[PDB]
UniProtKB/TrEMBL annotation, chain A:
GO biological process: transmembrane transport
Lineage: Bacteria, Pseudomonadati, Pseudomonadota, Gammaproteobacteria, Moraxellales
Matching Gene3D superfamilies: P-loop containing nucleotide triphosphate hydrolases
Subcellular location(s) per record: Cell inner membrane; Cytoplasm
Main location: membrane
Protein's name in the database: Lipopolysaccharide export system ATP-binding protein LptB
Topological category with respect to the lipid bilayer: Peripheral membrane protein
Domain (ABC transporter) ranges: 3-236
Keyword annotations from UniProtKB, A to Z: ATP-binding, Cell inner membrane, Cell membrane, Cytoplasm, Membrane, Nucleotide-binding, Translocase, Transport
Automatic annotation (TrEMBL), chain B:
Species lineage: Bacteria, Pseudomonadati, Pseudomonadota, Gammaproteobacteria, Moraxellales
One Pfam family here: LptF_LptG
Protein name: Permease
GO cellular component term of the entry, any: ATP-binding cassette (ABC) transporter complex
Role this protein plays: Part of the ABC transporter complex LptBFG involved in the translocation of lipopolysaccharide (LPS) from the inner membrane to the outer membrane.
Keyword match Transmembrane helix: yes
Annotated coiled-coil segments of the chain: none
Protein family membership: Belongs to the LptF/LptG family.
Keywords assigned by UniProt, alphabetized: Cell membrane, Membrane, Transmembrane, Transmembrane helix
InterPro entries for this protein: LptG, LptG/LptF_permease
Membrane topology field: Multi-pass membrane protein
From TrEMBL, chain C:
Domain of life (superkingdom): Bacteria
Biological process per Gene Ontology, one example term: lipopolysaccharide transport
Classification via Pfam families: LptF_LptG
Family membership noted in the UniProt record: Belongs to the LptF/LptG family.
Annotated protein name in UniProt: Lipopolysaccharide export system permease protein LptF
Keywords: Cell inner membrane, Cell membrane, Membrane, Transmembrane, Transmembrane helix, Transport
One GO cellular component term noted in the UniProt record for this chain: ATP-binding cassette (ABC) transporter complex
Quaternary assembly: Component of the lipopolysaccharide transport and assembly complex. The LptBFG transporter is composed of two ATP-binding proteins (LptB) and two transmembrane proteins (LptF and LptG).
Protein localization: Cell inner membrane
Membrane topology: Multi-pass membrane protein
TM region(s), chain numbering: 11-31, 58-80, 100-119, 208-229, 241-258, 270-287
Automatic annotation (TrEMBL), chain D:
Protein species of origin: Acinetobacter baylyi (strain ATCC 33305 / BD413 / ADP1)
Compartment(s) of residence: Cell inner membrane; Cytoplasm
Lineage of producing organism: Bacteria, Pseudomonadati, Pseudomonadota, Gammaproteobacteria, Moraxellales
Oligomeric and partner information: Component of the lipopolysaccharide transport and assembly complex. The LptBFG transporter is composed of two ATP-binding proteins (LptB) and two transmembrane proteins (LptF and LptG).
The protein's name: Lipopolysaccharide export system ATP-binding protein LptB
Family: Belongs to the ABC transporter superfamily. Outer membrane lipopolysaccharide export (TC 1.B.42) family.
MF annotations from Gene Ontology: ATP binding; ATP hydrolysis activity
Length: 238, 297, 289, 239
């Protein structure tokens, strides 16, 4: 599956923050949507999710135009979103968070929903907190429950927003292992992040957007040896 | 889906009921300060306490507005409404879950209006303390000096004159005698429709009873519509705002709606068009405007 | 520069709040007056003059409330968007910022001193003459369509009524003469001069003290808005409004409860500054904790 | 000259967030207060500034207790604060932002104040944008106006909160020169930041606050070789 995105555009206060941002993503592949802060990497990311309405552009997913659909109508097509901020259901237990979205899945029955919930808890090692409220778990443990909850909806493309946000260097490997696990599960991952040192370490194909347009494209090795990216975003030393 | 539905409904229901408890307690305390003017004080606390169901009945439309603002505001500010859309739960489904919470308040509004308010109102009047000079039945004008629910100096005039009959002790019925002094607004729907049907069978129903009838039949629809406006504001203008700002705005919509429904109620008694236009005016427009803010997502 | 920065902000947002409260406090009364006018108990063409004459009465309460709310919105904004961390971090406390607004509060005190002493009585004097002129309406002036109106020895029934209260239809008049026709066409206001020296009487002792010690609620609204304005950036600019409007309103409710207990010669006029001093000292102590 | 912090402590919701945090910072020296996220490095920083009440311990500045002084009273003692979030006076001109704090200074007359403002604008290359509002400037230029404003108060210690927050790698070096310039100005700088890799590149003495207590101390080279830090904070391979 391919999430073709063509000629995105959006203006704010009569100023075009995003001008002709176009990139392509495939299932089972990590793609990093990077760039200078405020240059349109966040806004172009949100127009893929659906939070920000698209002024101009075309977002197809395997000959399925997802341009006119809202946030939820795209999510039913197989697009996932993991907010940077804490988005766990505070008053629902960790097992109820995953079970809340599993009941939304129409591809299962009560018998296999409990089996799917059990293995999702075991996959992310949150079984020991399956009965604790979502508001009373560690930030590292909660984020694993948010990803497990997102995987309960069976997404084809998981768009991660700032995954390495407030993550210590000891636990940056844990996030990379999670993101690598999503790729091995057949889910394409779109990462937008301010921490470009580690986002350029897991992504297979990165898009640098500056001044509202994509200024470079390719593997992280090609991104580093790009004169425009080095001059504008990464700097002479990196 | 049931676990998500219970979480959205219970969170909003506790916010609608929590605001209801607070708003009634504040209005009982504020009203108690006022009556104290015309003072015994205890005789004045029971009169205000007995009026609590009637203060409760008039708070339900504004407690449901603030309840949906605070109930969904807690969900919105915690980024919980974003992850319901991220899995395939529409905006109109989340609104439908909040309406389920408001439907408890609508049923509570019916119970107070039909069986609770008309009783505690009568008990309140006694604490503070049978129609006299009652004045048309088609072509006949009837004046009775004293009328009892169980007559004195009757006077009936027939119409060109035929007979002016007088007695010392006709379509008048004792059942509706006790409803004559009661304001049309205060009458319960069971009492109002029965009284209007009685007047319409023998005379013309005044426009102050038509307005009271329309202000009651459109009371459940103003509670649901005002909830939908609250939900659309959370997904629209009041998204990412503080909890205090949402509460402040929820108070401006509540007063704006109470003033608009008060003013357009009065305007229906001075202008030719039927009170249905003035009562169902804002309700239809807020539903259309509220449903548009939901279409903008 | 920091004093002019605050005065411009407080004046701008206090005038917005004052105009917002005037639209709400007297918009509700204007609608209620319109409700009386819709039943014929008040001329529909004068209810805008009633609002004009009750401007000083409501603005007597809104001005301390608008200044108090406008003070906390400004001081809330400084806290929310981190302009207070760089003002405290530069040596300028919150108490010092509230002391830069004493010249502004004095202007608002003088303004309300004009309202309380002069325009509130003058507005209430003209309103009392006007309202008493609307209490004499009787007979066909109070008529309502499809209803019987009895005023003394008169009983009037009109089958229809125009948008204006003229051109009645299906008129029934009773005394005994029966006529049927198809068509038919206070110390609160006394000038201060009087209560100026006429003390030693609970009536004036309560009113005149209410006019002299009344304007000093602006100062209390200044040092109590400074005390109750500390709010976290994530909490919001409006977080401490509703909790602290009730703390301010508890002062006014106490002052109305003192005006009455003086009028009944039970408390004495000395309790006006005492009520303000207790709230003044409590606010000063809380701002310095 | 020597800001001394001893035995800081603070309990939130019956949980001791900070337990026995003590570090020393001298004037003209850059000190980085690092550590795992939520381990008390942020709370211990705030007790130094004054944005949270120290439940236990003391703060000294060259034989002058500052524990009992509020945030504004320490600022008169020469301690500055630079919030991570946008703290510019939004509706004030950038020249007025620096001037609003220069008029606070008592040892500067009108003429001496206009000069200081002129040279403060030139030092941070914002004299071209000195006539624009605080809220209508670039993110990079706004922070340069907040540091020029902070220097107008003439601090002896500057407590920077997340200086490398939301900063592109091109503009990280720009902040390095600013912090290096602050040290060259004789002003000690205390830095708390999540970006440990770049914070360790300017600080000459770093403190690692884990589980509420200081577990490491010394130059960034000594922090990296510490086996206790690399087990809890930095991880096996960090450079
Ligand atoms: C030193 C100090 C210096 C400074 C000092 C200052 C001085 C003090 C003040 C002096 C200047 C004031 C001059 C004055 O006078 O200010 C009077 C009013 C102000 C008094 C202030 C007292 C001090 C308080 C200090 C507070 C400081 C903060 C006017 C007047 O006097 O009003 C009097 C008027 N009273 C009111 O309106 C209440 C007044 C009271 C308002 C006071 C509280 C708010 C004020 C401050 C707001 C601050 C917001 C920031 O509301 C209103 O003003 C309109 C509503 C305004 C709401 C604004 C809210 C804004 C919120 C925005 C969102 C954030 C009264 O109405 C009658 C009934 O009508 C409705 O009932 P019905 O529908 O009929 O059943 C009301 N129902 C209602 O309101 C409620 C309705 O059911 C609706 C229910 C649903 C809404 C409520 C649910 C939630 C409630 C609680 C929420 C918190 C009933 O309310 C009552 O029962 C009492 C009841 O608690 C009222 C409601 C509860 C309190 C109100 C809270 C509202 C809050 C909103 C959200 C926060 C009320 O009983 O008629 C009198 C004349 O009637 C008579 C007579 O008896 O003589 C008999 C008539 O027949 C006729 O004959 C008439 C004749 O034409 C002339 O004689 O005469 C009028 O007097 P008159 O003109 O002199 O004759
Ligand atoms: C009975 N009072 C009034 O007539 C004031 C007068 C102010 C508006 C008109 N100028 N107005 C009212 O009461 C009317 C309702 C009465 C029917 N119209 N609206 C609520 C209203 C308007 C203005 C102030 N309070 C109210 S209701 C209220 C609120 C808080 C406390 C109290 C209270 C309760 C009990 C006692 C006691 O037992 O001694 C004392 C005070 C009250 C009750 N109101 C009072 O005691 C005052 C006392 C008062 C006399 N003149 C004044 C001029 C300015 C301010 C207040 C007064
Ligand atoms: C702004 C909220 C923050 C805190 C506020 C603290 C106090 C709030 C003040 C509320 C003012 C009360 O409002 C006052 O209620 C009393 C209730 O007896 C009303 O009183 C009215 O109805 C009663 C009930 O039959 C009559 O007996 C009375 O003659 C009539 O005037 C006043 O018309 C109204 O002005």
């Amino acid at each position: 599956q391919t999430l073709c995105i063509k000629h995105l555009a959006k203006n704010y206060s009569k100023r075009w923050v995003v001008k002709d941002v176009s990139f392509e993503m495939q299932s089972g592949q990590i793609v990093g949507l990077l760039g200078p802060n405020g240059a349109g990497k966040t806004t172009s990311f949100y127009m893929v999710v659906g939070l920000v309405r698209m002024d101009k552009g075309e977002i197809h997913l395997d000959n399925l135009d997802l341009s006119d659909l809202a946030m939820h109508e795209r999510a039913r097509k197989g697009i996932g979103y993991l907010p940077q901020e804490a988005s766990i259901f505070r008053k629902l237990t960790i097992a109820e968070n995953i079970m809340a979205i599993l009941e939304t899945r129409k591809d299962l029955n009560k018998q296999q929903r409990q089996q799917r919930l059990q293995e999702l808890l075991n996959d992310f090692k949150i079984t020991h907190i399956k009965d604790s409220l979502g508001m009373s778990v560690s930030g590292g443990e909660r984020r694993r429950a948010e990803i497990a909850r997102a995987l309960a909806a069976d997404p084809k493309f998981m768009l991660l927003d700032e995954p390495f946000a407030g993550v210590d260097p000891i636990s940056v490997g844990d996030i990379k292992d999670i993101i690598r696990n999503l790729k091995d599960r057949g889910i394409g991952v779109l990462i937008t992040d301010h921490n470009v040192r580690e986002t350029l370490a897991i992504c297979e194909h990165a898009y640098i957007v500056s001044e509202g347009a994509v200024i470079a494209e390719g593997s992280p090795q090609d991104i580093l040896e790009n004169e425009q990216v080095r001059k504008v975003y990464l700097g002479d030393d990196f | 889906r049931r676990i998500v539905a219970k979480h959205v409904t219970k969170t909003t229901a506790l916010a609608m009921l929590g605001t209801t408890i607070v708003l009634v307690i504040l209005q009982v305390l504020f009203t108690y300060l006022g009556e104290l003017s015309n003072l015994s004080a205890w005789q004045a606390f029971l009169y205000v306490l007995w009026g609590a169901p009637r203060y409760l009945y008039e708070i339900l439309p504004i407690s449901a507005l603030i309840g949906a603002i605070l109930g969904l505001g807690t969900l919105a500010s915690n980024s919980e409404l974003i992850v319901m859309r991220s899995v395939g739960i529409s905006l109109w489904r989340i609104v439908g879950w909040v309406i389920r919470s408001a439907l408890v308040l609508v049923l509570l509004s019916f119970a107070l209006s039909e069986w609770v308010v008309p009783y505690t109102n009568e008990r309140a009047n006694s604490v503070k303390s049978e129609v006299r000079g009652y004045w048309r039945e088609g072509q006949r004008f009837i004046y009775v000096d004293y009328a009892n629910s169980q007559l004195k100096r009757i006077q009936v005039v027939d119409f060109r004159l035929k007979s002016v009959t007088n007695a010392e002790q006709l379509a008048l019925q004792p059942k509706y005698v006790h409803m004559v002094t009661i304001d049309p607004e205060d009458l319960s729907f069971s009492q109002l429709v029965s009284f209007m049907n009685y007047m319409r069978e023998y005379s013309q129903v005044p426009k102050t009873y038509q307005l009271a009838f329309w202000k009651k039949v459109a009371s459940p629809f103003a509670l649901i519509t005002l909830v939908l406006v609250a939900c659309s504001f959370i997904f629209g203008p009041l998204r990412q705002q503080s909890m205090g700002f949402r509460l402040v705005i929820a108070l401006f919509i509540g007063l704006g709606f109470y003033y608009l429904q008060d003013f357009l109620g009065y305007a229906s008694l001075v202008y030719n068009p039927s009170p249905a236009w003035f009562v169902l005016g804002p309700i239809v427009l807020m539903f259309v405007a509220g449903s548009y803010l939901l279409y903008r997502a | 520069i920091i004093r002019r920065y605050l005065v411009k902000q407080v004046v701008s947002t206090s005038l917005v709040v004052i105009a917002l409260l005037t639209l709400i406090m007297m918009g509700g009364r204007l609608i209620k007056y319109f409700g009386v006018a819709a039943q014929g108990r008040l001329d529909a063409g004068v209810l805008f003059s009633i609002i004009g004459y009750r401007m000083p009465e409501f603005l007597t309460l809104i001005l301390p409330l608008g200044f108090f709310i406008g003070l906390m919105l400004v001081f809330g904004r400084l806290y929310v968007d981190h302009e207070m961390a760089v003002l405290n971090g530069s040596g300028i406390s919150r108490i010092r910022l509230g002391q830069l607004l004493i010249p502004l509060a004095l202007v608002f005190l003088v303004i309300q001193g004009i309202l309380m002493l002069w325009m509130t009585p003058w507005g209430l004097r003209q309103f009392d003459q006007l309202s008493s002129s609307q209490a004499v309406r009787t007979g066909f002036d109070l008529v309502r369509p499809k209803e019987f109106i009895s005023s003394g020895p008169y009983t009037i029934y009109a089958g229809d009524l125009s948008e204006d209260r003229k051109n009645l239809k299906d008129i029934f008049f009773y005394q005994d003469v029966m006529i049927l026709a198809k068509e038919a066409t206070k110390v609160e206001a006394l000038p201060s001069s009087k209560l100026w020296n006429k003390w030693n009487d609970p009536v004036i002792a309560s009113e005149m003290g209410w006019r002299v010690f009344g304007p000093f609620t602006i100062v209390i609204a200044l040092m109590m808005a400074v005390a109750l304005c500390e709010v976290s950036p994530r909490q919001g600019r409006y977080y401490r409004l509703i909790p602290a409007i009730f703390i301010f309103a508890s002062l006014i409710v106490l002052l109305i409860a003192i005006r009455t207990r003086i009028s009944r010669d039970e408390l004495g006029v000395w309790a006006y500054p005492a009520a303000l001093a207790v709230y003044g000292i409590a606010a000063a102590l809380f701002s310095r904790k």
